[PDB]
Design a protein around this ligand. Structure first.
Ligand SMILES: [Mg+2]
Ligand SMILES: [Mg+2]
Ligand SMILES: [Mg+2]
Ligand SMILES: [Mg+2]
Ligand SMILES: [Mg+2]
Ligand SMILES: [Mg+2]
Ligand SMILES: [Mg+2]
Ligand SMILES: [Mg+2]
Ligand SMILES: [Mg+2]
Ligand SMILES: [Mg+2]
Ligand SMILES: [Mg+2]
Ligand SMILES: [Mg+2]
Ligand SMILES: [Mg+2]
Ligand SMILES: [Mg+2]
Ligand SMILES: [Mg+2]
Ligand SMILES: [Mg+2]
Ligand SMILES: [Mg+2]
Ligand SMILES: [Mg+2]
Ligand SMILES: [Mg+2]
Lengths: 155, 82, 129, 205, 80, 14
RNA sequence: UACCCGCAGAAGAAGCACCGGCUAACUCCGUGCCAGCAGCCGCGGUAAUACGGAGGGUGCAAGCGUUAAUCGGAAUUACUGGGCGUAAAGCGCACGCAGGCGGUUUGUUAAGUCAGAUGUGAAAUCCCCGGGCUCAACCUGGGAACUGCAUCUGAUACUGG
RNA sequence: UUAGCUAGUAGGUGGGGUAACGGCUCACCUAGGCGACGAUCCCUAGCUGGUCUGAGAGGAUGACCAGCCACACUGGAACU
């Protein structure tokens, strides 16, 4: 029922008295395809041990987001360390156009039609962090009508 | 002078003519004044392919525009079919 | 200094909204009343009162959701260093039509949703996002 | 402007039935269908993110026999037409003249149905169009000319597609040896497992 | 009704002629800032009534010299 | 950064 | 001449580049930091899918590669849409003209702006729906577009006088 | 890493001049004109409707088509 996808694998090391001891970092995302994305992070000695620990954190740290029939409500800015994220919802049937980092986030939510462009740094771990937090401050026409207080055409 | 003539457009081995008003010092595809109509010599002649407007024709003939013999054949048959 | 007083007004709104302040005060003017009364009629704020006639002091009542900012962000668009003007069909929307764009025309201060029935354009004041 | 290699070798490269033969002999009784062509066909290959857009493109193009110069021109038209991109992509692929003959069943294979269009046998409203890439307009009626009715490639093909299911938007008449292309097909009327969004993204970069 | 310009005078030393400067506000084609652009014209002054800094109304005429193409109508404000 | 600075001199393309 | 009738028989009609990653495809032998390869990363001194060859495959196609040039990628001259404590960058500091900008209330002008309308923005190109050449390219009907400029009549909230 | 340039030059009278207005030309009279919103000098370039690239804003350029200007071995001049 959960839809998973590996993003990137990067071998890192730690320096000791006897020399160097390597390890692995794995970034994964999961989702149900209906507006729930949970990303995790893993640190282990072995590569299938590395991707599994990222999946174990991925069951929690999973949020909710308001979709509009499989696309965004409105374009929203994303800001991070070096990942200037600018998305925009498209018309019906345009398809997913994004980098390989953003495609893992957008597929597991069920999102189909979005413009996407990342400016600045191209680190795949920094792009997805602003991508998740850019969706939670992205708001719905119903919850801004709980602010404004009117059941008129804007809903 | 102010004259009424044709301008050959269309691809090679596919002749087509534009009905424009121009000066004698210009070329065949030269500097015209206004577009009047069109002519298709490779028309099937069961449908569209020749249409002009006598209102813009009588506006310039009364001012003294000369007419070539090829364009005047369309003038001599616009009253037979219509 | 205080050369853009509308930008000074937007600074005092955005700070107290985020810093959990209950109410803010600011020096009043004619144009600041013509903006806050529109925001009162668009559900972003609650109430405004005038105090003083030789020193006009405007007050704004804030608005929250569960202690959360109703006005998440607001953006000054035109400025004394660069004036911005649009026509009746080039009116920009905020969040694809969710937020409103305060545009003052000859028929008073209204939104771009209200400028459709009016059919006018002019100076963009702020993107109420 | 064609492909002269083995037919089911393309299905050995992909792993998907492409209707490249008739249907009398089974798909697995000729070759191991999940074996890649060559030395390491039993070895499982890695599938990258760039692959799933490329392998989906190769699946559709080997069905219709459309090369890269013409398939990009179809994307030039599918972008300019309004509506959905993938729905307009299927309109150019199914509206091909060699596909209309094949889905009615006058040709047993798509390679045979292309030759029946090419070698002067198909009438389109009483007119012979000898190219296989004709965009067929709606509300047309196609037929076989008077000299090609006696050919055995029509006699042997009217029973193989009759065993299989027929499309809805076509009206196949075998006694008069004619057909009708009624309307434009839809997404759900065609193969649902073919994902048209995988191909558009490769031409979207 | 006819085409008519308005401006002020920056030079009046020559006889039967004055120099009228015209300022205009232009949206810049790249940035949009309204910039004062100076248009310095030479206007035929009959009887030499225009001084320095006079807001004046001018209209269009035939070319009277190598540089002049404008003539005078009336002075709006003189010598304030 | 200032638009009024670019009135005097635009951005110098290399 | 296109077109069309008739004849004979698959007979007259497929190649190039790549194959470590980027980027589609894996093994084997030969050579031994020599030879070579190469756009980047950097490959090869005794096991090289990266060199040379073979096997097999991939991507294209009557074309396929390479070189040179322009833009894009490059938000890498950042108006849209960048920075300046230490990554390149805030003049050593201060005065001040020209220039830019300017609190608040009212009246007036309608300058900027906005609304409407006229005239104009040649045709061709691009876009919309069509038609035509067996198809496409291509040709072509009308419309839209050409966000421009000039003038008149308006509205007065903001900017200017 | 071009800041002052310019005496038929700027303006006026009169005469002359071309198809037409005009330092277009001549005598006289005035000392102005231009210019930090780039005068002047040096280098480069035919320009535009457009093509190409780009989500757009922008960017690079001006072959074929069309419009205009200039040029016809080099330089100068007039006739018709
Ligand atoms: Mg963490
Ligand atoms: Mg960077
Ligand atoms: Mg030829
Ligand atoms: Mg691979
Ligand atoms: Mg080689
Ligand atoms: Mg060896
Ligand atoms: Mg070809
Ligand atoms: Mg280069
Ligand atoms: Mg750039
Ligand atoms: Mg930077
Ligand atoms: Mg430094
Ligand atoms: Mg200091
Ligand atoms: Mg035009
Ligand atoms: Mg036209
Ligand atoms: Mg056209
Ligand atoms: Mg057609
Ligand atoms: Mg004189
Ligand atoms: Mg020529
Ligand atoms: Mg020319």
């Amino acid at each position: 029922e959960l839809q998973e996808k590996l993003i990137a694998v990067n071998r890192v090391s730690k320096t000791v008295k006897g020399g160097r001891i390597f390890s692995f970092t794995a970034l994964t995302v999961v989702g149900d395809g209906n507006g729930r994305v949970g990303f995790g992070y893993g640190k282990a000695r072995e590569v299938p041990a590395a991707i599994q620990k990222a999946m174990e954190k991925a069951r929690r740290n999973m949020i909710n987001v308001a979709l509009n029939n499989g696309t965004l409500q409105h374009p929203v800015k994303g800001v991070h360390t070096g990942s200037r994220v600018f998305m925009q919802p498209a018309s019906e049937g345009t398809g997913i156009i994004a980098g390989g980092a953003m495609r893992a986030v957008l597929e597991v939510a069920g999102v189909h039609n979005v413009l996407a462009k990342a400016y600045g740094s191209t680190n795949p771990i920094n792009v997805v962090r602003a991508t998740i937090d850019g969706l939670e401050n992205m708001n719905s026409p119903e919850m801004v009508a709980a602010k404004r207080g009117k059941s008129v055409e804007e809903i | 002078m102010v004259t009424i003539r044709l301008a050959r457009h269309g691809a090679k081995k596919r002749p087509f003519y534009q009905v424009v008003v121009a000066d004698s010092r210009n070329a065949r595809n030269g500097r015209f004044i206004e577009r009047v109509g069109f002519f298709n010599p490779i028309a099937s002649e069961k449908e569209e392919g020749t249409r002009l407007d006598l209102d813009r024709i009588a506006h310039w003939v009364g001012q003294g525009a000369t007419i070539s013999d090829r364009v005047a054949a369309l003038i001599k048959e616009v009253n037979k079919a219509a | 200094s205080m050369q853009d007083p509308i930008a000074d007004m937007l600074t005092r709104i955005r700070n107290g909204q985020a810093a959990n302040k209950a109410a803010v005060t600011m020096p009043s003017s004619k144009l600041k009343v013509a903006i806050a009364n529109v925001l009162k009629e668009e559900g972003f704020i609650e109430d405004f009162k005038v105090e003083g006639d030789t020193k006009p002091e405007l007050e704004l009542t804030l608005k929250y959701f569960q202690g959360k900012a109703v006005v998440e962000s607001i953006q000054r668009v035109s400025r004394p260093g660069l004036r911005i003007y649009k026509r009746k069909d080039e009116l920009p929307k905020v969040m694809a039509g969710l937020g409103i764009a305060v545009v003052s025309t000859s028929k008073g201060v209204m939104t771009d949703r209200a400028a459709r029935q009016a059919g006018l354009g002019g100076e963009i004041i702020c993107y109420v996002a | 402007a064609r492909y002269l290699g083995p037919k089911l070798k393309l299905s050995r490269r992909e792993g998907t039935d492409l209707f490249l033969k008739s249907g009398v002999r089974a798909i697995d009784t000729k070759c191991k269908i999940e074996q890649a062509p060559g030395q390491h066909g039993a070895r499982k290959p890695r599938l990258s993110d760039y692959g799933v857009q490329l392998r989906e493109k190769q699946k559709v193009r080997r069905i219709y026999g459309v090369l890269e110069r013409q398939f990009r021109n179809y994307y030039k038209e599918a972008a300019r037409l309004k509506g959905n991109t993938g729905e307009n992509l299927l309109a150019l692929l199914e509206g091909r003249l060699d596909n209309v003959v094949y889905r009615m069943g006058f040709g047993a294979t798509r390679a045979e149905a292309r030759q029946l269009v090419s070698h002067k046998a198909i009438m389109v409203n009483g007119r012979v169009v000898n190219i296989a890439s004709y965009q067929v307009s709606p509300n047309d009626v196609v037929s076989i000319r008077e000299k090609a009715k006696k050919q055995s490639r029509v006699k042997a093909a009217l029973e193989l597609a009759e065993q299989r299911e027929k499309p809805t938007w076509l009206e196949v008449d075998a006694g008069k040896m004619e057909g009708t292309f009624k309307r434009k097909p839809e997404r759900s009327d065609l193969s649902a497992d073919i994902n048209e969004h995988l191909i558009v993204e490769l031409y979207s970069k | 009704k006819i085409r008519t310009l308005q401006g002020r005078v920056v030079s009046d030393k020559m006889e039967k002629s004055i120099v009228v400067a015209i300022e205009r506000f232009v949206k810049h084609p790249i940035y949009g800032k309204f910039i004062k652009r100076t248009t310095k014209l030479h206007v035929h002054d009959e009887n030499n009534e225009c001084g320095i800094g006079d807001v004046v109304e001018i209209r269009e005429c035939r070319p009277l010299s190598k540089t002049k193409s404008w003539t005078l109508v009336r002075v709006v404000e003189k010598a304030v | 950064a200032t638009v009024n600075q670019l009135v005097r001199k635009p951005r110098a393309r290399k």
